[PDB]
């Protein structure tokens, strides 16, 4: 937006193995889950009509926002993405009731998340 960025030259944003890994491996596969479809759209607040979302939920994020910072090389490595990825899941659990479809989906979505994360390069290699 006009203020907070998704890409910035002065701000470090190198390409490491972990970074490129989670981008194409983790979130892109999370994306391919047919239950991850309600997370295909970022919280624009207006588009999805979520005005009080920005009041209750701390960091209104999803999967399109995470991948946006990833493809724009916002961080240095995927370790920084572990923050936004973590919030996207909790956000759904908090705003939505545990009996909601989106919650039921998020629970299953989380499986492939940790699945690919456990297989992450535990050493890291800057490209």
């Amino acid at each position: 937006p006009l203020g907070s960025e998704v890409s910035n030259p002065s701000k470090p944003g190198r390409k490491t193995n972990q970074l490129q890994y989670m981008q194409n491996v983790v979130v892109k596969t999370l994306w391919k889950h047919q239950f991850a479809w309600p997370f295909y759209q970022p919280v624009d607040a207006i588009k999805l009509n979520l005005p009080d979302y920005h009041k209750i939920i701390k960091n209104p994020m999803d999967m399109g926002t995470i991948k946006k910072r990833l493809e724009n090389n916002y961080y240095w490595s995927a370790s920084e993405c572990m923050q936004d990825f973590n919030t996207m899941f909790t956000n759904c659990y908090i705003y939505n009731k545990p009996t909601d479809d989106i919650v039921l989906m998020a629970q299953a979505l989380e499986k492939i998340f940790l699945q690919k994360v456990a297989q992450m390069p535990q050493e890291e290699v800057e490209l």
Partner: peptide, 6 residues
Amino acid sequence: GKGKKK
């Protein structure tokens, strides 16, 4: 929307 997207 938010509320059972089935």
